[PDB]
Amino acid sequence: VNSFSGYLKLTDNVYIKNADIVEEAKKVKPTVVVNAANVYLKHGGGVAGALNKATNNAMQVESDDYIATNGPLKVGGSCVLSGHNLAKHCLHVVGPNVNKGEDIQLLKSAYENFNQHEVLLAPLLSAGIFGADPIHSLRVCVDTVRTNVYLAVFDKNLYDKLVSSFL
């Protein structure tokens, strides 16, 4: 038993809800929140800028120190940093950016990072401003993640479409 509420159960291990991930994180304070990161950990907008804003820019300060030491992430890769006021940990995961010509096949590699964590609150990777179709992202999630994932879907009309079309 965990503290996530109001999710629809899609499979043994995948749950979904129409929610802003920032609001879900503040209320639940999960062990792991997933950020939809880019390779530079430049959290300007989307999931990243909203989470970062909720941390009063502490996420960005920590991230800039990480990059100065380690260099950029790989597309499909991840790093674990602090969850600040939102979670114990933040798993920064880089999904492909379709608008930059990045291989959509790397979306599966991105979701594989979730399997290193028993329970996660996550958004639909590569959705929103990253230019991928949320319907495909959900399918890859279900077919790749084996740990327990609670998906916060920002858009209600897309949420209802994701549910109605789910196989």
Ligand SMILES: Nc1ncn(Cc2cccc(C(F)(F)F)c2)c2ncnc1-2
């Ligand atoms: N605060 C937030 N900002 C951005 N996104 C990404 C996102 C934007 C637009 C649509 C969709 C989707 F999944 F419905 F297609 C996802 C968030 N997802 C959860 N919370 C979010």
